[PDB]
Amino acid sequence: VDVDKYTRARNAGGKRAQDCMLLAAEGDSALSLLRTGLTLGKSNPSGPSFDFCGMISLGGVIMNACKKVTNITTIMVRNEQLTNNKVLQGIVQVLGLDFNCHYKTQEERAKLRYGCIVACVDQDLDGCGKILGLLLAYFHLFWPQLIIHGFVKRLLTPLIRVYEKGKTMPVEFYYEQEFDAWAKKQTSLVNHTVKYYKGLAAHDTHEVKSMFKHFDNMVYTFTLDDSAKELFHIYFGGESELRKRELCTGVVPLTETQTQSIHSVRRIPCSLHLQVDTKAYKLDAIERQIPNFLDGMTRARRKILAGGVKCFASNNRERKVFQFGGYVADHMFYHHGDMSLNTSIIKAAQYYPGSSHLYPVFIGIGSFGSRHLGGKDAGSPRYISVQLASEFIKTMFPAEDSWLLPYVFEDGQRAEPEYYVPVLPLAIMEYGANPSEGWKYTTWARQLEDILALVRAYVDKDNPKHELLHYAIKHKITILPLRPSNYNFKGHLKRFGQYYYSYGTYDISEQRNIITITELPLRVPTVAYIESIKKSSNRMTFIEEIIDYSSSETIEILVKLPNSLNRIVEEFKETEEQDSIENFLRLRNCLHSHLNFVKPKGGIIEFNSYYEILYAWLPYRRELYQKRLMREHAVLKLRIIMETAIVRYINESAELNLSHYEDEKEASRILSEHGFPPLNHTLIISPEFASIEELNQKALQGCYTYILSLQARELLIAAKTRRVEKIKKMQARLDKVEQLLQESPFPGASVWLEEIDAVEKAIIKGRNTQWKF
Amino acid sequence: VDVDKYTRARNAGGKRAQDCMLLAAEGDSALSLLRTGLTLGKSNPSGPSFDFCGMISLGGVIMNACKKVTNITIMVRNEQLTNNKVLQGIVQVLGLDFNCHYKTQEERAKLRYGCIVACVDQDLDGCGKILGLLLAYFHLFWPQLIIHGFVKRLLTPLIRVYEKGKTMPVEFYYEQEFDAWAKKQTSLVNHTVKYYKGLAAHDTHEVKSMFKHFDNMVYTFTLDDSAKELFHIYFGGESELRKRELCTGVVPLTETQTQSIHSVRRIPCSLHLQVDTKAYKLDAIERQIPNFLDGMTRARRKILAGGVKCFASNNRERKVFQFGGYVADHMFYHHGDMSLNTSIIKAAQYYPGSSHLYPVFIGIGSFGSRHLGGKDAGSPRYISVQLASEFIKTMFPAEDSWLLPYVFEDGQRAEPEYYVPVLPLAIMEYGANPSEGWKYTTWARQLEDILALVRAYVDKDNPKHELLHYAIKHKITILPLRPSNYNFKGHLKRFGQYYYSYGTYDISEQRNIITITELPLRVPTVAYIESIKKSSNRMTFIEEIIDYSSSETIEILVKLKPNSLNRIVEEFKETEEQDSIENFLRLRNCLHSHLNFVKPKGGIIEFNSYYEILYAWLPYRRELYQKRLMREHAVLKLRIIMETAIVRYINESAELNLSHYEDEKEASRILSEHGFPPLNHTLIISPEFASIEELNQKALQGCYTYILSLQARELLIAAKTRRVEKIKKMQARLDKVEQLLQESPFPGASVWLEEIDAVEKAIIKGRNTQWKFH
DNA sequence: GATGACGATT
DNA sequence: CGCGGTAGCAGTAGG
DNA sequence: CCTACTGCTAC
DNA sequence: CGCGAATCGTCATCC
Ligand SMILES: [Mg+2]
Ligand SMILES: [Mg+2]
Ligand SMILES: [Mg+2]
Ligand SMILES: [Mg+2]
Ligand SMILES: [Mg+2]
């Protein structure tokens, strides 16, 4: 056969056709690895080869067949989309598969062009979890007998290899979970190197030779059982409610008996693979696509922010998107393709009416797209550059707080935090709408002034509502509003029953048969609207032309209707929820919300209203003010002790001439003999992520270095006057922190209110400059 | 008209069709900006709009029509030019007629638009190549249309520089004129430079300004007697005319020509070809043809210099797209990331026949195979690069890099103009690319021959040393530089002075088979097999071809038809330059060389032999060893002086109680009164790129920071005793440097031999490790 | 039935 | 997870 | 002769 | 300088 991305095995379809394997890989780069391994003259005699092995590309993610089939009774009818899929239709041609056959007898199977198919997917969760599950679901849906009789197989490859400086042999892992456990449980990985294999093509020469030296001893066969049929419907059927049930809990790990049994005979039940590999993907896809309720960010957008703060710290000089993306993927350990990261960066910096972000993390330099095309008319990442919206970020995400956040560790190293805790509840302040596994995500930004009133009343005791709001929250009866935002909207909003709705604006003119549309409902792109209207034969009966005179950010569509306005009212219908002229031009939109978010420790959580998201975020922000303030108190005490000792050394440096002492170790003794405290200076000047316990526990690992590396410029008494000034100001700050801790209703309430005013100033300023500053 | 990537102008094809403009842009990103400008209702009615403007993208670089017409019959377009989606799409939108000549005002009034406006990027690729190609399209078919102003241009800046406070930036239209302007400035410490790689890079307040002044920034092209010949020079089928034209630099326009252009906004095509198109072509030669000193193009030099920076603290491996981003930022890369990621991958490939016998990087992952010519490499997201630091440390000494002349991009230091490696790298690799005017092709010279020549030139004790120096003086060959055979299991033969490459085969009459066990030099396996079966004459005697090649090796099974072996010998003649199986299976290959390189001064140079490239490289490497040694002498003198002062303070630190002085000034007064020299410590500790005289004049004009920033631990007698040794080792090294300078046959000859031995050991190690060094 | 959307992924 | 179009020069080949 | 490949560095 | 095939979960509309 002549199929694209297919390299035939020599004996395929011939006398020895049942001795051949079809290696299905994720893409061309993975095919290049398989080609290299099958072309080894020094792997023999059991080394695989093109005598009995073929290659075919799966084209990345294949199509879910279970969701494109209609049952018919006297029959399973395949849809167009499934019938005309090039990748799957190529696999059917290469294998000589027949949808009418059920392949139960070894006669019936011996007319196939290959003996089996071996899924050589990448070990990333997308590969073994998603793509492999889709392939298993394809065969189970059409030819379940082939799974019973061992036709569907798998090649196991590592996902992580960690090498030691000594040992010539690495430690190999097949799951990020099991490596991360191994990494934290290790003492330190100081002389190791960790390598994550996002695709097959990442394996090096001597690594490829090892994998093919043990090829068939890494090939596993799939098996079927009664439990499989229902599980395939759970994970890949049409009812997402089951996914909502399955994804409430984490994966149930394999027992020591199941693991040992599987590896001894190299057989994997389809039910176990769906429960472990496929499910682990499904939970992971939720973490990628569903944002956290604390900061309203996905993992990519949080890595992009954390990387942005690092990259745009020294300079904040603009950098092109493709350059910034590489920095993010390197310093924040990003295990996926650069295409999806570069696009996320652009979507994170877009600022137009209807955009996802009312308060974008970055400033966009260049053509970043327009409302009229929904932001998809942005320039390629090679031209446009981003730049941190540093005034907003510095106020919304305080730098002091970031040391105290819990952090994700990828490849054995610290990466982005598990979550940020912004000063205002950012998860309800922006727009969002994307699907995921099991749950959909959709948010419509809440009004800024309502958020301020509510949050400020919770913290400001002098606010009239302070008694009363806390009493209301304990009994879950809400008194203050959280209404949809009206910013960047030239229309109005209405609330009917259980939904809020969005309304455009229009103007009629009787002198010359025109309707001028000057606003569309929230998040509606102009071009698609015009297209969608002219695609109506009902309406276009009465329109002769539609002309678009909108400006870059505004909307102005002139619609030339003979006297037909009367019919429109008759042909359509007028209610208290929608004018007929507003039915004629679809100027109405329903604010459907799907408030599903991710938990701090991990998992899905469903919210019923925007109020609960605010109430759930407040304790984390309340508690975080304690740690900063508590830690500042602890560090200030130590810095005072250190500076006081240094000023005492400067006062004793002239008589206590260090010039005469022989060694570094001697000089450390004479400072101890003079009553100087041994101090762990590096931790005092730069505590970084040190917890309070670590602070007090390691502050005594002294070395007297804080004196010995003191420069001569510090001996000058003006530098010493600045030190004594610094001591007095730190001693003054210490007493304000003690008061700020003993504050009501909780430590740091006044600090929270100050920073709330600071964030508001940044938003007001950004809003007046179109987030250009 | 329903043309792809075309947004119809409202009055196109109507009464007011001659008032409508077609904006031709470089691509989609540029189209989106024009859309933003055409859709401003506050740009004043002055601003243009979609009432009278259309957009179409040119698809990047358009097709050269002048080389796809026979036209002698008038204007006969070949299939490829007839079926060009971009060009025939512009003909569809405008309603152009190849049979019309557009002399009269009927014929121009039968056009769907009034003119076309080239809104190309201001980089030399845009206005020089693409616009010149577009002008050549209209000039070739409808010269009258250019006479009457149908072809136009929108002028846009290429660089903008902003000063703190000042609101209006200074704008440039040529990188050369900015680079000149930058050097004459005092310092760019309070400026910011910005390069516009495409139109889409302009920001909001910039786009609003450009469209506010749209009508007065559009220029019209005009024709003259000299234009027709110049269009044939630059875009015709005689490369010899390009070879003559590109010998010379661009001749800048006089203030009279500049004033005339800007006063009426009309540009002669001859002038545009002479400045913009030529400036591109000269630049393209520098981009694509490598320098004869280091054998690198401009991009590969940026990739090396960027690699040394990236992999300096940590030779930790990085993905190609990550490293590519690093290079484009730190080395100022003004082009697309696609060709940069590709150049990086080709720079790290190591397989038989690959361009590089001595790759700059180590490749971790699938970096491609001999069988597909390296086009089966993984996507840049999977594979990783890593500096071949042992090779880089020896071939490109770090000390030398401080002394090279450097390129300055955006007013800042980038990659060097050229490296001067320890061995002549331009004759040590394989190369083959076209360019403007000249082609480039080299076949790597044998390493043992390279060593013999270079070692004899430097080692006075070599028997051939006296005799070799006589040979360079008269350009006569005494020693051989034969093509390299490394990673080649075939044969090489010499006829006249041309080398040929031979595969290897084994015949088998027991079962009518020819087994090919090697292909000629640089011949890719897959393309070779196809080339054989696409000839029906050869396939007459072939029933099957089977490919059993291994990772680097070759084993192609060729099965013949029953009684063909006797008939092949007659049908395929047996000469002394190939027998009848090497003609039959095309197992011979000629090492054609095109030794054209780029000069240090910025021009092309043609060489006649590989000897001349070696002879031309030797002076640069000889002088660099001198310059290096002289500067070390200068720095060592200063560091000794500085350390001597520091140790004298440590012995005087007890009496000179800095504790009692109030400010640094007092401290500066009291040390000077004690005879301490004011020193420019930063320059003495870190000379960086300071020239020797530049060094000599400022190192003794600084202050007392070398004293004031001394920490207390240095006052300990152990720390001052370590300094006194450090001074003593520098004083010994100073006397050794004076010996190396007083050396024969030239200063630093013995060091050159040392570093040659270091380079060979590194190459031997890489060759034993498959260029993994692990 | 058939055909669209998003963000973060292959 | 992949995909093309274009220039430039000069060799080869096939037709 | 015409037309089609092939490379690297670009759009 | 540009091009595409796929998933997922609700929502929409045209015939
Ligand atoms: Mg993958
Ligand atoms: Mg992780
Ligand atoms: Mg003293
Ligand atoms: Mg450009
Ligand atoms: Mg330059």
CB-nearest to A716 from B324, B664, B715 is B664
Beta strands in A107-202 (DSSP E): 116-120, 152-155, 160-164, 171-173, 192-196
Those residues whose C-beta lies under 8 Å from the C-beta of residue A180, and which sit 6 or more positions away, are: A409
B263 within some domain:
yes
The verdict on A318 and A421 lying in the same domain is yes
Q: Which residue has the tokens 């048969």?
A: A513
Is there a contact between B322 and A337 if contact means CB atoms under 8 Å apart?
A: no
Q: Which residue has the tokens 């924040």?
A: A332
Residues in chain A: 773
Pairing mode, if any, of strands B542-547 and B556-560? Answer: antiparallel
Q: What phi and psi values does residue A30 have, to the nearest 5 degrees?
A: -70, -35
- How many angstroms separate the CA atoms of A651 and A657, rounded? 11
Is there a contact between B378 and A205 if contact means CB atoms under 8 Å apart?
A: no
CA B441-B442-B446 angle, 5° bins: 170
Task: Using an 8 Å CB-CB cutoff, list chain B residues near A657.
Answer: 653-654
By C-alpha distance, the chain A residue nearest B553 is A41
Is residue B322 a contact partner of residue A330, using CB atoms and an 8 Å limit? yes
Long-range pairs for B644-647: beta carbons < 8 A, 24 or more residues apart: B644/B727, B645/B676, B645/B677, B645/B679, B645/B706, B645/B707, B646/B706, B646/B707, B646/B710, B646/B714, B646/B723, B647/B720, B647/B723, B647/B724, B647/B727
Is there a contact between B329 and A338 if contact means CB atoms under 8 Å apart?
A: no
The whole-angstrom distance between residue B466's C-alpha and the CA centroid of its chain comes to 38
The verdict on A696 and A715 lying in the same domain is yes
Tokens of B628: 């290096």
Beta strands in B253-307 (DSSP E): 266-268
Task: Using an 8 Å CB-CB cutoff, list chain B residues near A378.
Answer: 32
- How many angstroms separate the CA atoms of A616 and A621, rounded? 10
Q: Which residue has the tokens 């896809």?
A: A285
Is residue A266 a contact partner of residue A219, using CB atoms and an 8 Å limit? yes
- How many angstroms separate the CA atoms of A345 and B325, rounded? 15
Is there a contact between B382 and A556 if contact means CB atoms under 8 Å apart?
A: no
Is residue B520 a contact partner of residue B532, using CB atoms and an 8 Å limit? no
Q: What phi and psi values does residue A414 have, to the nearest 5 degrees?
A: -70, 135
Distance, CA of A230 to C1' of C2, in Å: 28
- How many angstroms separate the CA atoms of A132 and A24, rounded? 10
- How many angstroms separate the CA atoms of B66 and B698, rounded? 59
Identify which of A202, A695, A303, A13 has the alpha carbon closest to the alpha carbon of residue B367: A202
- How many angstroms separate the CA atoms of B94 and B81, rounded? 18
CB-nearest to A39 from B384, B550, B711 is B550
B322 within some domain:
yes
Question: Nucleotide E8: nearest residue by CA–C1'?
Answer: B433
Residues after which chain B is discontinuous, using a C–N cutoff of 2.5 Å: 72
Is residue A428 a contact partner of residue A296, using CB atoms and an 8 Å limit? yes
A444 within some domain:
no
* Protein side of the strand E interface (CB < 7 A): B 26-27, 59-61, 68, 70, 78-80, 121, 123, 125-126, 130, 197, 287-288, 297-300, 334-336, 338-340, 342-343, 346-347, 355, 373-375, 432-435, 439, 527
The verdict on B208 and B219 lying in the same domain is yes
- Among B260, B284, B308, give the residue marking a domain's end: B284
Task: Using an 8 Å CB-CB cutoff, list chain A residues near B361.
Answer: none
Q: How many CB atoms lie within 10 A of CB B563?
A: 9
Q: Is position A383 annotated as part of the catalytic site? A: yes
Q: Interhelix angle for A338-349 vs A321-331, to 10°?
A: 120
DSSP B128: I
Identify which of B146, B17, B144 has the alpha carbon closest to the alpha carbon of residue B93: B17
Min Cα–Cα distance to chain B from A28, Å: 8
Long-range pairs for A466-469: beta carbons < 8 A, 24 or more residues apart: A466/A745
Q: Which residues surround ligand 1, an ion (CB under 5 A)?
A: A 122, 124, 199
Q: Please state, in angstroms and as integers, the Cα–Cα distance from residue A626 to each residue in A743, A744, A759, following that order.
A: 11, 12, 20
Residues after which chain A is discontinuous, using a C–N cutoff of 2.5 Å: 74, 561
The verdict on B15 and B127 lying in the same domain is yes
Min Cα–Cα distance to chain B from A69, Å: 35
The verdict on B239 and B301 lying in the same domain is no
- How many angstroms separate the CA atoms of B380 and A337, rounded? 10
DSSP B445: B
Identify which of A418, A404, A354, A320 has the alpha carbon closest to the alpha carbon of residue A624: A404
The verdict on A371 and A327 lying in the same domain is yes
CB-nearest to A40 from B197, B205, B551 is B551
- How many angstroms separate the CA atoms of B180 and A60, rounded? 51
In the set B6, B102, B351, B382, the catalytic residue is B382
Write the CATH number for B381. 3.90.199.10
Q: Which H, E and C letters describe A209-253, residue by residue?
A: HHHHHCCHHHEEEEECCHHHHHHHHHHHCCCHHHHHHHCCCCCCC
> Which nucleotide lies closest to A374 by the C1' atom and the CA atom?
C6
Is there a contact between B381 and A39 if contact means CB atoms under 8 Å apart?
A: no
Is residue B96 a contact partner of residue B90, using CB atoms and an 8 Å limit? yes
Type and span of the H or E element at A545: strand A545-548
CB-nearest to B712 from A39, A41, A710 is A710
Those residues whose C-beta lies under 8 Å from the C-beta of residue A623, and which sit 6 or more positions away, are: none
B410 Cα: distance to centroid of ligand 5 (angstroms): 8
DSSP B715: G
Sheet of A152-155, strands arranged across: A6-7, A53-57, A21-25, A116-120, A152-155, A219-223, A267-269
Binding residues of A for Mg(2+): 26, 122, 124
Binding residues of B for Mg(2+): 26, 121, 123
Write the CATH number for B71. 3.40.50.670
Question: Nucleotide E1: nearest residue by CA–C1'?
Answer: B70
A602 within some domain:
no
- How many angstroms separate the CA atoms of B360 and B377, rounded? 17
- How many angstroms separate the CA atoms of A154 and A174, rounded? 14
Is residue B321 a contact partner of residue B381, using CB atoms and an 8 Å limit? yes
The whole-angstrom distance between residue A450's C-alpha and the CA centroid of its chain comes to 28
Distance, CA of A556 to C1' of D3, in Å: 38
DSSP B97: -
Identify which of A237, A240, A223, A38 has the alpha carbon closest to the alpha carbon of residue A147: A223
A433 within some domain:
no
In the set A383, A471, A487, A499, the catalytic residue is A383
B455 within some domain:
no
The verdict on B584 and B632 lying in the same domain is no
Pairing mode, if any, of strands B151-154 and B115-119? Answer: parallel
The verdict on B506 and B635 lying in the same domain is no
On the 0-12 / 13-18 / 19+ scale of CB atoms within 10 A, A71 is exposed
- How many angstroms separate the CA atoms of A422 and A548, rounded? 41
3-state secondary structure of B607: coil
A551 within some domain:
yes
- Among A375, A408, A425, give the residue marking a domain's end: A425
- Among A590, A607, A635, give the residue marking a domain's end: A590
Q: Which H, E and C letters describe A675-725, residue by residue?
A: CCCCCCHHHHHCCCCCCHHHHHHHCCCCCCHHHHCCEHHHHCHHHHHHHHH
The verdict on B723 and B578 lying in the same domain is no
Tokens of B10: 């409202």
A204 within some domain:
yes
The verdict on B276 and B310 lying in the same domain is no
Min Cα–Cα distance to chain A from B126, Å: 15
The verdict on B122 and B253 lying in the same domain is yes
Q: DSSP letters along A152-168, please?
A: EEEE---SEEEEESS-S
The verdict on B245 and B112 lying in the same domain is yes
Give me the number of domains chain A comprises: 4
Amino acid at position A460, single letter? D
* Domain residue limits at A731: 617-741
The approach used to solve this structure was X-ray
Those residues whose C-beta lies under 8 Å from the C-beta of residue B40, and which sit 6 or more positions away, are: A551, A552, B47, B208, B211
Question: How many interchain CB pairs under 8 A, A with B?
Answer: 228
Is the torsion defined by CA of B28, B29, B30, B35 positive or negative? positive
By C-alpha distance, the chain A residue nearest B375 is A32
Residues in chain B: 774
Write the CATH number for B559. 3.30.1360.40
